[PDB]
From Swiss-Prot:
Changing residue 35 to P: In CTRCT4; uncertain significance. Signal peptide: none annotated. PROSITE patterns: CRYSTALLIN_BETA_GAMMA (PS50915). It comes from Homo sapiens. Gene3D superfamilies: Crystallins. Residues 1-39, 40-82, 87-127, 128-170 form the Beta/gamma crystallin 'Greek key' domain. This is Gamma-crystallin D. Keywords: Cataract, Disease variant, Eye lens protein, Repeat, Sensory transduction, Vision. Monomer. Disulfide bonds: none annotated. The keyword Zinc-finger does not apply.
Amino acid sequence: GKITLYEDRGFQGRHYECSSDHPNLQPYLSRCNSARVDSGCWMLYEQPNYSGLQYFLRRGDYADHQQWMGLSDSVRSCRLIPHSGSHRIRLYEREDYRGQMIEFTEDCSCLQDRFRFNEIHSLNVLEGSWVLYELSNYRGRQYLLMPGDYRRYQDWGATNARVGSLRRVIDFS
């Protein structure tokens, strides 16, 4: 579904609409302090070409950048995250799918309540897209995971293997 990005807080100022991935918003949007998603789920990125800090948004109105946990008003690309009916992910203790593993089909608000490792060193996203979070309860750095293999933490864009929670990419509506 459509995303509309606004330069000022409270859905004011210059705005820009996207209906598909946009790798470089810079010509169209100088800063981003509010957003409306008409439906579905989007990942915002601080840098062009789907790099830098990532932020998960879904259907709804976001009146300030803090409402998507944004650290600033820098948004320079955005990805439409594919819908999935079902979700399934395997999280591994070690790189290259080695060591102990835990499998989820639902959100997990605290990984260490279920798996006694502070780090995940590889993962396989079997069904659906997910957001991996550095910290428990969906906080800290965010990493979008789409269906595919992730042999080490660098494959999800992280600089270390710290994981605290993970969330299915789902539109409730």
